[PDB]
Amino acid sequence: NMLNPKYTFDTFVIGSGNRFAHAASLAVAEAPAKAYNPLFIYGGVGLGKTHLMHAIGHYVIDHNPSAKVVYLSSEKFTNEFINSIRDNKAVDFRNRYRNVDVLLIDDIQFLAGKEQTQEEFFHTFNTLHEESKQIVISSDRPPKEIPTLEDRLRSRFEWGLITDITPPDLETRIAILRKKAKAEGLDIPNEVMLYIANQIDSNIRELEGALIRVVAYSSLINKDINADLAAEALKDIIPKVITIKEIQRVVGQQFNIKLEDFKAKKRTKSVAFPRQIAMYLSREMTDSSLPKIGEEFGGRDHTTVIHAHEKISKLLADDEQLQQHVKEIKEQLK
Amino acid sequence: NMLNPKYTFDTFVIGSGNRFAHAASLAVAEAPAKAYNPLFIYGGVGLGKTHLMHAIGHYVIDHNPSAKVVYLSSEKFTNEFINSIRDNKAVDFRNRYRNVDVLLIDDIQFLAGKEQTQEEFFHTFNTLHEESKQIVISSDRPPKEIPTLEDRLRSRFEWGLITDITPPDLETRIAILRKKAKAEGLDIPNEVMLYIANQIDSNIRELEGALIRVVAYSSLINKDINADLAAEALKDISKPKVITIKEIQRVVGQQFNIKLEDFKAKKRTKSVAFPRQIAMYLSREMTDSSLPKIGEEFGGRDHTTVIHAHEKISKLLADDEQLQQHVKEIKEQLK
Amino acid sequence: NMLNPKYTFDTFVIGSGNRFAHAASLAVAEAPAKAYNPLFIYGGVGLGKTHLMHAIGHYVIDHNPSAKVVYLSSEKFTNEFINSIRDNKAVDFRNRYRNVDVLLIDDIQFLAGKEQTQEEFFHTFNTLHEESKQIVISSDRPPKEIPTLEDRLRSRFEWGLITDITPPDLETRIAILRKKAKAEGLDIPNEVMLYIANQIDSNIRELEGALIRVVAYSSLINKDINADLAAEALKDSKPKVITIKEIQRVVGQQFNIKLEDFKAKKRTKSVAFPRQIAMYLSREMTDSSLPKIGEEFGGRDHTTVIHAHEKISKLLADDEQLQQHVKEIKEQLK
DNA sequence: ACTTATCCACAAATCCACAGGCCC
DNA sequence: TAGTAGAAGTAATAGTAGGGCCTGTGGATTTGTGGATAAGT
Ligand SMILES: Nc1ncnc2c1ncn2[C@@H]1O[C@H](COP(=O)(O)OP(=O)(O)OP(=O)(O)O)[C@@H](O)[C@H]1O
Ligand SMILES: Nc1ncnc2c1ncn2[C@@H]1O[C@H](COP(=O)(O)OP(=O)(O)OP(=O)(O)O)[C@@H](O)[C@H]1O
Ligand SMILES: Nc1ncnc2c1ncn2[C@@H]1O[C@H](COP(=O)(O)OP(=O)(O)OP(=O)(O)O)[C@@H](O)[C@H]1O
Ligand SMILES: [Mg+2]
Ligand SMILES: [Mg+2]
Ligand SMILES: [Mg+2]
């Protein structure tokens, strides 16, 4: 059907960032339409939302062959809705999508900006919840911050349980890697898994891609996977914390001035202008507080910091090659 | 069909710079949607990405006549998408591009700056991957550095297997010359191909152009192909070593027996300044960096000092054949 | 149509400096899209490139009346492309220029700098090449020295065969003056033949212009053509085009500075004063654009030329010597 | 003690993306 | 057996990439010019 055999509760590795979502989803799977009817789950990219939805559908269909579970995306929903109302066959669209025992609608944020598709989904939600049919909704952002969503639809989103998924930590990253390797059926040393999980922490997808690249490169070189071969396979794939000290050093380097005279009390232009540019960069790049940066600037007052920042912003608002130099400095810092 | 009969896995030549991509493409063509469902090949220009895409298409079509293999470039995708939007046949566009066993989309970087087409390709990718359909994506730079690409699409690109093509080796350039000569069915002595391969190193396209020009000039003059005729034909036709300041000061320090760190020292002695003055001269002569940067590389020395040293060295070499010879030797060493 | 019938494969003669291009073009005409599919003819002005392109078009259309052969200059291509974008007829533009059997594009050099049209020409090239169509391109310089040409388009240009056109020699001039004499059906003495052959060598357009002048003089004088009449006709009535190269070479002759260093980034006063003088003179007596002057002089900005002209005007508004020298050089170049 | 080579402040020729007005 | 004259109809999408440049101030910026300064002789 429309579900994924690889996406099930057994393949899901439970961790700190997905324990709550997993438990809520498992409750919904065990007691459809009776425990948490409007379930809403949101998170980042490559975190397990569609995996969890397919696991819910798999569990319900496995335990209840007389269950009409339908998984779909928001894009497919709008496509089918508009096609139906263009073909003048809307009655069949309604008949299909109001009689589902479980509705697993995905990436609901796509509905933002489509007023009539939002209205049709609103009526679909009302009809499905009025008859005790399970509703699971997935998003990338909490329902509050989905734009162009009406109060009615948002309030239906918020009626039941709302969960969240957080990026995974090291232990569960290594656990996911071990599970994927064991499912594939190859023995990989634990040092390789630790190496990969350390040097790629973005989501499942780049982690899986790194594992696939390691395996493919090792198979090509017909050598057993080790830490050095994994390093060579991931040489071409592999952010830094910005530091006020590093910013000052860089700016002083470009603008022909030493390091010890940043805290000097000299008011010469040739030193003040690079210092003002460096402090403007620190203000508009780092989250460091104004008292802290002033302390790093030899105890300069917040009023003086304000005046220098405003002067630099206004002066840059009239020219472009200072912006070019700032862009070059930022590229160097990256 | 839309595929090239010239591009095939047979006509492709395995080199050290493309063995990985050839193996990945061959495995994908042997087992579509079952080995590496999203496959992402990136590299330089004229390096053999469309060759591999057409080769995969040919293999899949030949080994499965009933499979729908569709090859297109990014600009064709955008043109057809926008045309469908204007003509209200977007349903036809979706039904055409969401129901293919194998999709082969070329030069995906062109989508940078096309937000609606990026969304449409995102959804097409999602549908094809859900339905266990093979997707092959081509580009010149990895998805990390394609600008204005949504993180969802980037994460999809990074999901499967990403492989790269690197510029060809001398041996494989000679092999490509041999293969092309055999394909067009005339014989060329080995030294001519060796000369062409040594002289031309950018990508396959310039190599093919050089071979075509040599063959055509030989046919025109009605004389047999040799090294002198090849040179005459190619009269007007493995890396550009970009200079760097650390290299130039390393060369001058090895020439005049001064350590690296002392280059940033404040000493004003003659035996220190004169190498530094000629370093200023050669830096301004060769590199495109500003005199602010030339003062950066010596720990913040003034552009005025740099230019004063420059004109001093110019005046010196105006009457110093020994200095001219030394600077020429420095140029030869750095080149 | 758009093809000049004066140029045809019959009236072109195998010269010493153009036999290679003639043979390549003839092979292309005999076997379109099969022999040398991307054809690239680079050479000086008035040497036979347009003649060869028109001959190729004539041959292909004659031996295949159903073939779609289109010839155009790059100016027309750019203008049509821009107007298609402006009027939202870009679909019609693409339909016109991607479904032709043979395309003959003229003067590809000045596309240098005009971006977004060398991407549409890139896509047109790729469409024609993949659909097994024929492309002929004309230029005044080898592709490796066409400025601001993206590496992909450069590789596309160099993928094919490159033909060098050399200025004609004595025998070629003699042959084509015989050709024009047979074309226009008048008889001239061998003395005038040799005269016009050997004492006139800039380009064959100049040769034809001298022919026209001699014919007009003979018709006006109502006397038989002879060496004395030819010499009297060619003693000197033409407004010379004030070119940037002429201006800069006059400036260099007057100031003792070479020409190649004008491309150098060096901007000492002794060479910057002649540079800004040349910029002001070009702005004064050239209809050419300041960005074109900058590109011919190192790819500099138009605002640079504007500032140089403003500074020169300010200087001449105060110093009489500068005005006198400017008047002297203007009279010299006039 | 002075003058000479060297480093730094300062002003001007130059070059950048950027506002605008055609006008197609 | 040879058979008549039939009306009043809805609520509806999501939607693209794009042209140089003729001009033209504003302002950085990257230097040369001049001045300030240590030293060494
Ligand atoms: N905890 C986990 N354990 C195992 N696999 C996981 C886990 N979290 C995510 N994954 C992997 O995520 C992959 C795909 O991610 P998924 O589609 O579930 O997330 P998503 O990007 O949030 O979803 P969506 O498609 O709704 O945008 C699956 O193949 C699955 O193996
Ligand atoms: N081993 C090889 N690798 C690459 N190209 C080869 C090889 N052997 C022959 N060629 C020829 O050299 C040309 C270079 O490949 P290709 O044209 O695909 O470069 P590309 O820049 O990747 O193409 P595109 O720009 O369309 O992506 C091909 O047209 C091909 O016919
Ligand atoms: N080598 C030549 N021999 C004889 N005639 C020539 C030669 N070159 C140019 N001509 C004459 O010039 C005319 C047009 O060709 P020409 O070389 O002027 O094209 P062109 O200058 O390249 O034009 P464009 O710059 O528009 O491409 C022809 O009618 C031809 O008589
Ligand atoms: Mg989702
Ligand atoms: Mg490609
Ligand atoms: Mg021309």
Largest sheet of chain A: 5 strands, parallel
What is the C-alpha radius of gyration of chain A, as a whole number of Å? Answer: 27 Å
Instruction: Output the structural class of chain A.
Output: alpha/beta
Q: How would you classify the quaternary structure?
A: part of a larger assembly
Defining key terms:
part of a larger assembly; 3 chains; 334 residues; alpha/beta; 5-stranded parallel sheet; 5 strands; 55% helix; extended; binds adenosine-5'-triphosphate; binds magnesium ion; DNA-binding; cytoplasm (chain B); lipid binding (chain B)
Can you characterise this structure?
- The structure is cut from a larger assembly and holds 3 copies of chain A.
- Chain A has 334 residues and is α/β, with parallel strands linked by helices.
- The first copy, chain A, has helices spanning 19-30, 49-63, 74-87, 90-98, 115-130, 151-157, 170-184, 190-199, 204-220, 227-233, 244-254, 269-285, 290-296, 302-316, 321-333, and strands at 38-42, 69-73, 102-106, 134-139, 162-164.
- A 5-stranded parallel beta sheet of chain A has the order 2-3-4-1-5, with helices on both faces.
- In chain A, β3, α5 and β4 form a beta-alpha-beta unit.
- In chain A, α12 (269-285) crosses α14 (302-316).
- Chains A and B meet through α3, α9 and α11 of A and α1, α5, α6, β5 and α13 of B.
- The site of one magnesium ion has 5 residues of chain B, from α2.
- One magnesium ion (MG) is lined by residues 49-50, 106-107, 138 of chain B.
- The structure holds a DNA duplex (24 and 41 nucleotides).
- Chain C: This is Chromosomal replication initiator protein DnaA.
- Chain C: GO terms for molecular function: ATP binding; DNA replication origin binding; lipid binding.
- Chain C: Residues 2-218 are annotated as: Domain III, AAA+ region.
- Chain C: Keywords: ATP-binding, Cytoplasm, DNA replication, DNA-binding, Lipid-binding, Nucleotide-binding.
